Structure prediction request, 1381 residues.
Amino acid sequence: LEARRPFPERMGPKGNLIYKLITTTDHKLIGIMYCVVCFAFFLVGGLMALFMRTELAMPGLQFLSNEQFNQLFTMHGTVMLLFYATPIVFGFANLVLPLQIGAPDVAFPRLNALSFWLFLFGALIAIAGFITPGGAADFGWTAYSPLTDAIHSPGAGGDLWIMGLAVGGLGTILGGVNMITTVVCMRAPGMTMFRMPIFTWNILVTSILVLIAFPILTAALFGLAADRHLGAHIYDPANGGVLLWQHLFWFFGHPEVYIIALPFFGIVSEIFPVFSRKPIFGYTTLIYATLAIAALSVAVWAHHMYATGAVLLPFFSFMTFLIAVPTGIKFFNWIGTMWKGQLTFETPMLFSVGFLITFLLGGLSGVLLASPPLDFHVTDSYFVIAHFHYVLFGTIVFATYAGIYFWFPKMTGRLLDERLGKLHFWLTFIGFHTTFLVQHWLGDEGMPRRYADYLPTDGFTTLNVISTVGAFILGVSMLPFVWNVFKSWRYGEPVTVDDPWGYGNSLEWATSCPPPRHNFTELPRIRSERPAFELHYPHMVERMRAEAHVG
Amino acid sequence: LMGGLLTINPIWNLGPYKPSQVSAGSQPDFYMMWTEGLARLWPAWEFYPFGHTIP
Amino acid sequence: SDALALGWPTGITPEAKLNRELWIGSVIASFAVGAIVWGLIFWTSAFHRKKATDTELPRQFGYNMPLELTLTVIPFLIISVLFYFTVVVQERMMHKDPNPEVVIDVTAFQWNWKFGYQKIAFADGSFDYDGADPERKEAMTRTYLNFDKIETLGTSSEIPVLVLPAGKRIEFVLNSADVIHGFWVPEFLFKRDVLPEPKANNSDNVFQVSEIQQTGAFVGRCTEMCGTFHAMMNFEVRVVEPNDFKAYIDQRNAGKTNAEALAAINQPPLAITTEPFESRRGELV
Amino acid sequence: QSALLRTGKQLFETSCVSCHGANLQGVPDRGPSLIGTGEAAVYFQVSTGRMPAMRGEAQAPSKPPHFDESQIDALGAYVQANGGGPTVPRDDHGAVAQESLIGGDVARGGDLFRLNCASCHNFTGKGGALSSGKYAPDLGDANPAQIYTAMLTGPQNMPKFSDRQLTPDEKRDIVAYVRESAETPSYGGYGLGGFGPAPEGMAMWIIGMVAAIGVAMWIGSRA
Amino acid sequence: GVDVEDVPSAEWGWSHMPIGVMHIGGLLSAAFLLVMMRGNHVGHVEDWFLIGFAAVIVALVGRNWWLRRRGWIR
Amino acid sequence: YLLLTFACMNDIIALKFHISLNATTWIGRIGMVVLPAIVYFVAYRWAISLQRSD
Amino acid sequence: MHIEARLFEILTAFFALAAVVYAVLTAMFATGGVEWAGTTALVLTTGLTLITGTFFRFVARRLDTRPEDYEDAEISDGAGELGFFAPHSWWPILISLSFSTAAVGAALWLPWLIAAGVAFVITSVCGLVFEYYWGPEKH
Ligand code: HEA
Ligand code: HEA
Ligand SMILES: CCCCCCCCCCCCCCCC(=O)O[C@H](COC(=O)CCCCCCC[C@@H](C)CCCCCCCCC)COP(=O)(O)O[C@H]1[C@H](O)[C@H](O)[C@@H](O)[C@@H](O)[C@@H]1O
Ligand SMILES: CC(C)=CCC/C(C)=C/CC/C(C)=C/CC/C(C)=C/CC/C(C)=C/CC/C(C)=C/CC/C(C)=C/CC1=C(C)C(=O)c2ccccc2C1=O
Ligand code: HEC
Ligand code: HEC
Ligand SMILES: [Ca+2]
Ligand SMILES: [Cu+2]
Ligand SMILES: [Cu+2]
Ligand SMILES: [Cu+2]
Ligand SMILES: [Cu+2]
Prediction:
């Protein structure tokens, strides 16, 4: 009989990690660092949101001034969108994409570390605007043209914001280049492009979207910096400067939201088959839906601009409905995947269903927003706030947590606790709905977004109180997750097998937990989209080839 | 090359020393700065024992 | 009927009425779609779970081609219906009939408004006033800004009360001194962005209301971030009957403030739907 | 001219009434009163770009201007009539004096600048930090009229040097000194920002010792 | 004294510092931060920063001492 | 030493890299206690990690 | 790599249609005529996808089938040496710090800091590019 340890080594010795952190080219460690730093930035942005909600609880100005609340919503939106979501996308990519295609590494392993450090330092540069006496940027995360001039908002927080965004964008572009090259020309011998998982497809197309979007934002930010430090007149209102900035920024910004939407669609498309005990429904249909969404995401931007009166409404309205269709195809494919399975609702599956419900209501609100006549009433109100919070929280929070609970055993070799997982999920779900289901009603009555203060005659008091209660529930819900991760990194139940979820796919469940350096001591013969499942249950292969087609 | 291409201590701009006037950027050479730095940060702790002062 | 609007105030203009009808129908359709999809989700989550008596993995089916074709066709027709209604309503809402009864030169400057009464031409031939003031305009060569005689300046301690008649076709021309502001009157169920240079940026700064069914007081707010006091920029619209409106305009022709003429026409002099904001930065100041 | 006052009033009502109250009476917790400040004060605060301010913080920073020369002059005339205070000096042609404000005594100007001005700026007007988020800005970008109106109507935490405390000739000499300091070259090489031993130590550590250590690494061996 | 499994080249140089010195130094530094609260300053945000840093230093010291007490750190 | 040297220069640092001078003084006061400890910890761990690399 | 070039060709076609349709639909029916902002971005998005896909198609036409692109292939087909991958490096963090120094200089507009940041960027990029080519010190 074999010799083992009564419990695996909780932590390494002194000097086990810091040099690796400084000099790693391992995509797994880079993904880990991405996830940790992104969650820390998420904590900072959520603290900003908590301050905002506490101010908005009561109709006066109890502790924040106007300027501070403006800075709070600006930097909170910026931190949540750009210093947490896109980097967490690249973190998940770094964690599991080389594994999913049977590859030993990323294509340009030093460029990967460069992208991570550009992320970290650009995010810190943009946040450092708080140390300035004037405070950080206070013109929203959208940063419209005349208000971002040197005259309006003359402080240095705006400049630090612009340049930190530029550095983070360079890091993001380099990461996208790395991921596309890795996907294109480092796969395993059996891994044809129509055999890679949905996550790999989504990361590839997301990196293409990054390459399209982020350079335009970099150009616009360089133009704005030239305007502010040189008196350029690039965005002067006397030219088309106002609408020029709006066009450039939204041509960035809607591709950005689909950049942060597609990979988590891929993550849930990975997770559903594992806990449904059946293949992903419509594999090629899902690929075509992803491709259509990415294509349509580039030519829809000006639906963020219906209120200016300066854009062609029919073109962007029709394009927005047309881009809404493939996401519905995706939900019907996910329903088909769950359909007629053996569902065991372990924590990643629970967060995937939370994703389904949340992003469903968010998509309904979005197609409401697509219509220019309705957007005329509801734009720049909390109906928009509730809409994009529902979609961003279904996608970048629920699916991020599902991915973490899924791939934590694979990356660490230890299992997070299920009871804490259920507690944290239910806390997050209840808190989210409590704090965001009434902002629809708030915005429809006439409370505009980005207001630091209202009046008791406005009627905005009860719903703001309910939203602040829900925001504090969401803040409280982060204690179980942080505790779970902190305890289970070291004292979590060990994983000594491949595939701690049993019915996994996508070739990362055909290697140890954690995988070794260079990711693979063997590769199985790849014949289908789910090689690990047919490696662990060979008697099913025939059945998978006989029952695959309902019609 | 440095003595040619970099200006150090241009004392005509500073002017002669008069005890009644001072400039904003009063700093010693770098090797002494820590001394002045230690004077900036120490938090104004003084003692007055029996009719005397320890500044 | 009253709860499906999700907070949408009943409009005071016919365009707002049609927009609210469209919103309620769209909410009905979206709730129907959401009910279907949530029903599928909860049907699969409640039943279809794992049970003690299954040892064989399910049917490994991952393709139902006719169902995929049907479920791809259906969203296209749904969005087609929504697009048709959307285009009809939107063309109904941006019309700009070339003969408004009243023209208001809405000027939005940083954290207040200015209403001008550029031109008033009643259809029935009962009142006429040409407030267009080109002398001060050329003296202010910001030439894009429109100046009028009977202005209504709001101050950090006074909320401007836009006085309009009832049932007369009104027009708003929106211009901004420095930055983008937001013209929103939640009762109009419509808003627009007040841009600095509308013509250079190719913007429709002019929008028209066919008529206002109700005589009353309505709050208006800025709905584009403009700086620190973006929440401190409220205004009010008081829709009075045309006779009281003509009396107010006559009292304005003689040198008098807005409050003086409003009290002269038997109205409260200040804003009643919104009190002014304390210029104090807060409570611990 | 009264049309000057009319256009100045129109400019003030669409750009300054908020934070200033439409009658130059201060708006509480938003800004001060503007009665008695003077056309010189208005000229400084607008031509330097500081006004209009966009928010309240430790210091109102310098910005690009928001009004042309004649618009600044009209706003100044309006505030002067509604107020009563100092005015911008003007030359024979009736324009704001620019070249007729520079004196001929630069040693007197230097002594006055070091006693009165160099306390908060540098020896050469490079700027110095103040108590809590405030600072004395750079004097490099300031025409003689801007310096004159600055020292004559104390902008913000800058003490007001009245026409008796600093007579116009002494103000002219200080203006001359500031202009000469801004426009003069450096004789010993690239002036390291004119801030003294801090940039000099930085240049030593990053250009001198880096070069020395690189040369030693080239000459010597490793391990 | 220390072994070469934790510090590989412990035979080549001074590689162990007594835990008591770091514990006492942390507590003394927290005390210094606390002492800096009394002074000639009128602001109080810096007071919150001083209290927070003293709290985190004391928390780290107490955590380390407790874990070494129970043998979780050997 | 570096912290004291840059604290000496906090006026120019606050003028160029816009920061409150009081904020720089308080950062220096907290730092001249916190930063040495952080640097000790990081340097000790880094040296042991270099040994492990060898 | 037929499928990669096919994806980029499909994207190029759709983007060309979007750009041309937008240009025609705003030349007429838009206030200022051609929008001149969305049209440029869409045209050069077509250019981006066209460059990538056309290069991939030149690669794929002269390329014999790889194991990755050939269904029903064995793992043993992929045996041999893969290329070179850097085991470790501390140059990326220095490159990022140099770019951050230059970005801070440009944010606050300190020309000396911009110059120093660019010098650091050049030095650190030299270190990264030269890392695996420096030969033994010749003594
Ligand atoms: C990534 C997407 C994302 C996420 C996850 C969030 C998270 C949250 N957001 Fe935000 N939000 C945006 C995207 C997002 N937001 C965008 C794009 C804007 C626009 C900004 C702009 O207008 O410019 C915005 C702005 C915005 C508004 C609009 C305000 C206004 O316009 O007036 C509101 C309204 O309530 C809001 C609330 C919240 C709340 C309660 C959460 C909660 O879900 C957060 C829950 C997490 C926490 C509460 C953390 C708990 C904190 C602790 C446990 C303390 C410990 C921390 C440390 C020790 C460091 N945020
Ligand atoms: C995760 C990121 C994300 C995603 C995926 C989306 C997806 C969509 N969004 Fe939006 N959106 C944002 C992030 C996102 N959005 C952000 C951050 C803002 C505010 C930015 C700011 O101002 O700061 C915003 C604001 C925004 C605007 C700008 C309006 C305004 O500013 O007032 C519009 C306009 O059309 C819009 C609509 C849509 C539509 C139609 C979809 C569609 O893709 C949704 C499609 C999904 C469904 C429709 C549900 C599933 C479909 C079915 C089940 C089929 C049946 C459905 C039908 C038959 C219709 N959202
Ligand atoms: C070794 C290279 C040095 C050159 C050596 C060759 C020298 C030979 C002759 C010298 C020629 C210079 C003429 C003397 C004239 C002169 O000195 O040139 C300055 C020009 O401008 C600048 O400085 C910007 C220059 C940009 C490059 C500077 C290079 C800096 C290097 C040395 C960086 C080292 C520091 C490292 C940083 C560390 C990084 C972090 C670790 C003054 O500009 P000026 O037009 O007078 O305006 C002033 C305004 O600073 C002011 O804001 C205001 O406008 C005015 O008041 C005036 O003072
Ligand atoms: C003590 C403290 C809080 C300092 C904060 C100041 C600061 C770094 C503000 C930037 C915002 C922050 C904190 C960003 C953090 C994100 C990151 C990782 C940034 C990395 C880039 C960094 C740290 C840049 C700053 C580097 C720095 C502080 C250098 C010292 C600055 C000094 C005093 C330089 C000396 C110097 C001065 C002052 C000149 O005027 C001059 C003029 C002409 C030629 C040369 C010089 C010269 O060398
Ligand atoms: C709120 C943000 C304001 C706006 C809008 C305007 N001003 Fe103002 N004013 C404000 C502050 C916070 C201060 C003190 C800070 C400072 O830099 O002085 C001032 C002061 C002035 C002054 C100088 C007062 C003096 O004693 O001389 C002037 C001449 C002045 N303000 C004029 C002015 C003009 C012309 C404006 C419209 C362009 C204007 N202010 C707008 C606050 C605010
Ligand atoms: C207190 C410190 C002083 C003293 C004693 C002097 N200056 Fe000034 N200065 C100071 C501040 C805080 C400001 C900013 C004012 C504001 O933002 O409203 C200024 C401004 C100036 C300017 C204008 C700067 C520009 O053009 O961008 C000039 C030209 C100026 N100060 C010159 C000057 C002179 C000549 C002095 C001696 C008589 C002097 N200052 C003293 C701070 C302070
Ligand atoms: Ca409040
Ligand atoms: Cu969009
Ligand atoms: Cu808007
Ligand atoms: Cu506004
Ligand atoms: Cu506003």
Summary: The CA atoms of residues 190 and 200 of chain D lie 11 Å apart.
